[PDB]
Ligand binder design. Structure first.
Ligand code: HEM
Ligand code: HEM
Ligand code: HEM
Lengths: 726, 726, 308, 83
């Protein structure tokens, strides 16, 4: 038998910290985590243990190692149906990846409201706090292929499928509150410009190329989302630590028929946190699956991703009360003007069993609404409603994609639609049309109503000529980018400048760089000059003279637009690298591990080889990874306990570990003779804010380090990192 | 509520004769008819009564009569996701039809062996007479599309899927015991020659065109199956009244590893019966769905199609004992040489619920065998094994077609195949490869053995060089055609001559007709002369002198090759037209209807209009159809009861009804004054064989009519019909 | 050589009456008949005479009569790439038929206006009586599949693709001047009710069944087109002898921007003529390809279908 | 067949031979080539059997497999020489 005697092949079916066990299909890892959607998938889950290997026709296979041949050195025979079924299935495994958002990672969970919303919406899923709705959520990047890296600079997708009692609602959002373009007719142009260029299909997962910046320079409506992408919002630490937005204004409709405009928000209960660029880019090379891994291992540990759903609500009479058009998806609604009302909480608590069957095949579409919601005339939303139904026809093979298990509603569905490729449902209705007498008109229409009623559009007044024309109210491009800029902390503004500077340096045609700097000068001169200086460009007098755009309804900043201005840090689910030596001070390691456990912070024990080392008191410590195998890129903070520090003092890899973490603004803590490493990061004898140092690891050394971790990164260190060659 | 208040819209859920009630889905017509496969389809059967109409996402629809528009006379809006989901699904309802056998009709049933065959085969489904195997059978024509007519002249397909406990076994046969060609490499040539011609796509459902006979004239191997297609075997009365054959020699393998050669047969328990050509061709116009309809209505009546499986068995030591090669699919094995041993019984006892989902998506493939069976080197079989797997990947949309509910095994299936379009099964196995340790190598290979073993091929010796070469043993083309011809009755030989004569008359290029006639002269000079005379062709002295091919192992005829030489008539399930008048003798009608009921023979009451007529004694007679609506083509015999004959005596439709029935050799019975119709069909005063006549329908009138019905048709009338203008 | 000595295997490349010669591909039957669209298809026309038989990769085949096997009575070998290519292509011949109007018959031709219509429309194809526009036209039935019969009782389609200098215009019409239903939302209902019923897939090519009349009886907007279908309009003699209509009101827009409402009509220059029902129905059995054949043969004879 | 959408992938321009190709195969999704041969089968007489098979030869001949000797039983077995 091939499994090891000791049973160490099999992960424990209990939550465990990252790296402690091999990861596993969600139903094997967490068999008692259930919701109505996960339970309904039971009819299609297939096991394996104790079953005979068969063909797809149920024929048991005797020899799965050899083709059938004429003699054991002879030709393969065409009658080998076993070989050919197995190779045919393999030959046809792939399906088209998504046209955008092809790279994505997904989990099961549930949603529950905090109170009934029946005064604003008759949506059944929001009617009662004890109504639990299963969800399936997929997070994604935008530009790269399904095989591209996770920690690129990109917008991120945040798509949620609610399996409600009155239908599937998909909330298909992103991690920034606006889009790049105004009208869906432009989407193939913008997407072509950002995707790999058509001659040579370079670059992957990057906007750092001429075509993108050509389009941006000629389409200033893109400048607002460009500012977000260039900020640290473009490189989140985790899907758990980014915001989500629906972007468009939609409508809530109550049982009285009153419409309220809404924009949707997701607020991360782990707080907001992003990488820095150098770290992000390096992480695409050292772990291109970092975000997929982080999400799966968080759920396996019980560090469930949690988000609060939020609504910005604007009465119908206030449609024209702002400086910008509510229908314009390049404009955000500042939370200073319209606060976010917190409406419920979503928890993602179970990984899929099979990536392909549940994540790759999942189909989300913003036109999947339910009674109690309605659309608006936002012209980007309007065109999206067409695109998602259409693309699913080729990507998923035909018009029965709703019968793919992950996409099936959990509520009833009955109608007169029939056939299509890979039809699963076998209809018994004598009628396949209505009106019909032969089945007494079943299934029947249902009038709209306050609950379980049929869908009826809000009777919005339409008045105008049939025109292909952009609303003049959408023609203002610079005041939102300026508001976002002025709402950033000084360090966030510096990262924006550096984002633009690094990227535009990779544009080959210099006039495109100059055209973009000209657009920046319409937003903010300080920004425009700081980017220009890095590109060797000089602003003209005309450019130094452009009048700033106006404030937004009297606002010259909104701190809700910054990642870091208002503290919201949570250390639960973060990870620290502990750099070991061959006789660790065991009292340091006890203290550290204890303090980390108390806050839900994981640790990884690192050394120069695998296996184990022995602590001063004889404790055997198991090594998780090498210095070079689990780089500082992958952790939040680094601790070096006392002991035989000469063992690692001259280890290039250990030195570099600390140089890299320092450069990336991560908290570092040094105990006892570990303080010899201060030399490598150039720290004055008297200490520096963000380096924790003491004679040993006592309770106070840990409180200080965990305080640095709650603030995420040590922004005050930025002017000091220039001198470190890392 | 649109249903009539009397509930007449819904058919009774109990057996009823053809036409008595509207037809229905099999689970609503016969809910208590169950088998293991029909029970396993419960998970995908969808009802309808009492359910709300929804989108495929489960959203209730309020108004399924209107698109969303800006104003009730305004333009339709892109945001109507309900209109677009409904039209998108409709727009994608069609899938490719089968490349051959596109037109076919199917039903569910079950099979049981009469005794255990474990001495000759370890096949589980043949191991125990109390083992019931569910089946799904599809009957088909070969050339025409899925919308072509049923009663064309063509070979028929007879495909049976056995859902066994050790795997699906598909026995994919035809209604003749040989095929047209020897090696699969020719199959696209042959099928292209018989299909509609490629410039204009004509003719549908017919071999009566130049390309077919061009290929035949140049490929004498085809002549044997051509003889059968030109005979009345090419125009079966019903799928219930044709034979089936697997054509190829296969092997049975027993638990001791002994191989026995086998050819598969199905014998129709209802007997063998065919139409005549003019009737068949007329019926393609008046009811192009006649065989589909007859199959479905026989099942709803309780007249279940029954067939007996039988095997012709030949020991391995006797492979070379015949004048023909066992591996040559253009050669039959005469039952006089190798008798068919009865093996078991198949009953088809339930119709599908949804034709598309179950019939159209069904996939049969002769490579689907189970342990206990194996292949031989028949070069036509060997190529089929490649084709069915391949075609199904495009027809059914991908490699997961075994997950379509009709195709699923009822036994366990587990393996390491993953993904593909339309993937339903969600695999939870940690491993997707073997050998593996992480799942202790499950699912595991199973050694071969007497029961529940893995499949291993019979270790047949192969010896020879890699060649593209036809075996010289296959190089004989005329002896089997001659054996078939000499085995037919004189009236069957007349119909074969008429078959060739009518069909070659449609070949436009006369030299092709002359080439076919020359091939006939190598089969039998009497056949060749009779066909030449009809075509205005004179055989040359050379042709008159071709020597006949040899007898087949000493045989000069085998009566098992004729439809009619050995009586096997069965009247149950047949149908008689009764031509009413406005004052029917009610005592005639009582005697006629009860005698037919007692033998399971159906009746259809016909008149010149719909509604009712009233018999001499006041009995109200409900009319099934008019004389034009339900022509004689659709019944087996015609009865005219006494009454007011002058009512119908001058009705051109009634007279022509009898003229057509008479021409087509059907029994006709005339009571009382109905004898006045003797002048219409030119019957002598003292009467003639095949016309039943009496003063009333009492005494022996119905027994005499039923005796004629058991003989099927009045062959003795053939020389009398040439004169009547019908 | 397999052809007969006298050359009678090959139809004359001149106009001939129906039945005088075997029918043939248009470019072989009428090589001097050309238009801009027929010429443009030259890049993809493939001949055959004097060429070697090859795989799709251009490899010449020596023996197209046999699979590769180990001995001449032995098993077929997986390395036979010639057999597998030929059988792969055959196995993948079919594509889905059209959801409606799956049975149809088509020909090439040309159009030209009698006079410029520039007062009412700027459409370039209507701008000059001497500017000829190629067309491709398909006629069809509605309900039956691609292999159903021609002379059923049904509405007929009349679809014309005009290959204009300013883009393709498709006029996709039928042979009666109205449709059965008012709103496209109901089309899948109406089509389902007319098509073969879902349990047993019967009847083909026929509205003579319960579901269709159930729908009609509950949707009186259907009655107009039902009248046309029940008249001898439902059974035309030929596609040359029926009317065509676009059904919907469309607009014409001239250079000054003026809109005029328009309905489109085709008038058959051969006249209007239909079968009688007993004839139509028997002809579905004796020649289910009657209209397809009659159209192709009229064109081979020089009796070109003409419409106004 | 599934990656490139059907059996006519040799007609996608990059995959096309530059040398002649002619046979009796027809149809399939995405069919570009418009065949004018009156026959779509062989042997035929109606187009004098063209396009025709070609015997093997030193240049420009038909493909024939090398006539390697095959001898053994039908087995699913690795050759011991591979172990
Ligand atoms: C506010 C603007 C938009 C946002 C927030 C948005 C968000 C997303 C997200 C999150 C996904 C990935 C869903 C998944 O995980 O499977 C997605 C996929 C997609 N988006 Fe959008 N998108 C926007 C605009 C558009 C526009 C204007 C179009 C086209 C008109 C479009 C067409 C698509 C298509 C074709 C896919 C692939 C869907 C699939 O294959 O199932 N997107 N988008
Ligand atoms: C003894 C000779 C043969 C018999 C008895 C036979 C019988 C049949 C039958 C009954 C069907 C229809 C199964 C159904 O109802 O779905 C069928 C379909 C098929 N046949 Fe065969 N056949 C023969 C030879 C061949 C050969 C030589 C090839 C190709 C090498 C072939 C390729 C096909 C294909 C592609 C289909 C359609 C299968 C599908 O789409 O699922 N047939 N044949
Ligand atoms: C005025 C009413 C209509 C007329 C005159 C009409 C006419 C036709 C004709 C002549 C064709 C066949 C074109 C060809 O030869 O390939 C066709 C195909 C079709 N029709 Fe319409 N039709 C009408 C209404 C509709 C409606 C309301 C819909 C759906 C909303 C529709 C959907 C289709 C579809 C899906 C096809 C198949 C087209 C293809 O596969 O290329 N038809 N129709």
């Amino acid at each position: 038998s091939l499994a090891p005697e000791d049973g160490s092949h099999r992960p424990a079916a209990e939550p465990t910290p990252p790296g402690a066990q091999p990861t596993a299909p969600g139903s094997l890892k967490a068999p008692d985590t259930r919701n109505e959607k996960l339970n309904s998938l039971e009819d299609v889950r297939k096991g394996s243990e104790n079953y005979a290997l068969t063909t797809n026709q149920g024929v048991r296979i005797a020899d799965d190692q050899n083709s059938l041949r004429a003699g054991s050195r002879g030709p393969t025979l065409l009658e080998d149906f076993i070989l050919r079924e197995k190779i045919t299935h393999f030959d046809h495994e792939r399906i088209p990846e998504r046209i955008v958002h092809a790279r994505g990672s997904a989990a099961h969970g549930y949603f529950q409201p905090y109170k009934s919303l029946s005064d604003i919406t008759k949506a059944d899923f929001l009617s009662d706090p004890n109504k639990i709705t299963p969800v399936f959520v997929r997070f994604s990047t935008v530009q790269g292929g399904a095989g591209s890296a996770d920690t690129v600079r990109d917008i991120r997708g945040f798509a949620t499928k609610f399996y409600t009692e009155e239908g599937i609602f998909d909330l298909v959002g992103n991690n920034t509150p606006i889009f790049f373009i105004q009208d869906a007719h432009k989407f193939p142009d913008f997407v072509h410009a950002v995707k790999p260029e058509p001659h040579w299909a370079i670059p992957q997962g990057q906007s750092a190329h001429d075509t993108f910046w050509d389009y941006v320079s000629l389409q200033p409506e893109t400048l607002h989302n460009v500012m977000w992408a260039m900020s640290d919002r473009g490189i989140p630490r985790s899907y758990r630590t980014m915001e989500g937005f629906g972007i468009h204004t939609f409508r809530l409709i109550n049982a009285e028929g009153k419409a309220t405009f809404v924009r949707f928000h997701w607020k991360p209960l782990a707080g907001k946190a992003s990488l820095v660029w150098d770290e992000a880019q390096k992480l695409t090379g050292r772990d291109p699956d970092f975000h997929r891994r982080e999400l799966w291992e968080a759920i396996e540990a019980g560090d469930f991703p949690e988000y609060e759903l939020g609504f910005q609500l604007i009465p119908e009479e206030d449609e024209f009360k702002f400086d910008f058009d509510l229908l314009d998806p390049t404009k955000l609604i500042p939370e200073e003007l319209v606060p976010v009302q917190r409406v419920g909480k979503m928890v993602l608590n179970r990984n899929p069993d099979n990536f392909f069957a549940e994540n790759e095949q999942a189909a989300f579409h913003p036109g999947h609404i339910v009674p109690g919601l309605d659309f608006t005339n936002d012209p980007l939303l309007q065109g999206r409603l067409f695109s998602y139904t259409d693309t699913q026809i080729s990507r998923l093979g035909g018009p029965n994609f709703h019968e793919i298990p992950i996409n099936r509603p959990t509520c009833p569905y009955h109608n007169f639609q029939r056939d299509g490729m890979h039809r699963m449902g076998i209809d018994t209705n004598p009628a396949n049309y209505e009106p019909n007498s032969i089945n007494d008109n079943w299934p029947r229409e249902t009038p709209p109503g306050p609950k379980r009623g049929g869908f009826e559009s809000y009777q919005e007044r339409v008045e105008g000529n049939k025109v292909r024309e952009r609303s003049p109210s959408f023609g203002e491009y610079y005041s939102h980018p300026r508001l976002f800029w002025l709402s950033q902390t000084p360090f966030e503004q510096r990262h924006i400048v550096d984002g633009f500077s690094f990227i535009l340096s990779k544009v080959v045609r210099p006039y495109i760089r100059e055209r973009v700097v000209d657009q920046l000068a319409h937003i903010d001169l300080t920004l425009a000059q700081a980017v220009a200086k890095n590109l060797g460009i000089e602003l003209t007098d005309d450019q130094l003279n452009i009048t700033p755009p106006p404030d937004v309804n009297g606002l010259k900043k909104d701190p809700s637009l910054s990642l870091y201005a208002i503290p919201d840090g949570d250390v639960k689910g973060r990870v620290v690298a502990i750099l070991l030596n061959d006789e660790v001070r065991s009292a340091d390691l006890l203290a550290i591990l204890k303090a980390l456990k108390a806050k839900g912070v994981h640790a990884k024990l690192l050394y120069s080889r695998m296996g184990e080392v022995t602590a001063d008191d004889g404790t055997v410590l198991p090594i998780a990874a090498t210095f070079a195998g689990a780089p500082s890129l992958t952790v939040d903070a680094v601790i070096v306990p006392c002991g035989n520090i000469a063992d690692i003092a001259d280890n290039g890899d250990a030195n570099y570990y600390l140089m890299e973490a320092y450069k990336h603004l991560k908290p570092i803590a040094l105990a006892g003779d570990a303080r010899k490493f201060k030399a490598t990061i150039k720290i004055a004898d008297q200490g520096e804010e963000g380096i924790v140092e003491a004679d040993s690891a006592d309770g106070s050394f840990m409180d200080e380090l965990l305080t640095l971790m709650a603030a995420h990164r040590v922004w005050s260190r930025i002017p000091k990192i220039d001198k470190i060659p890392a």
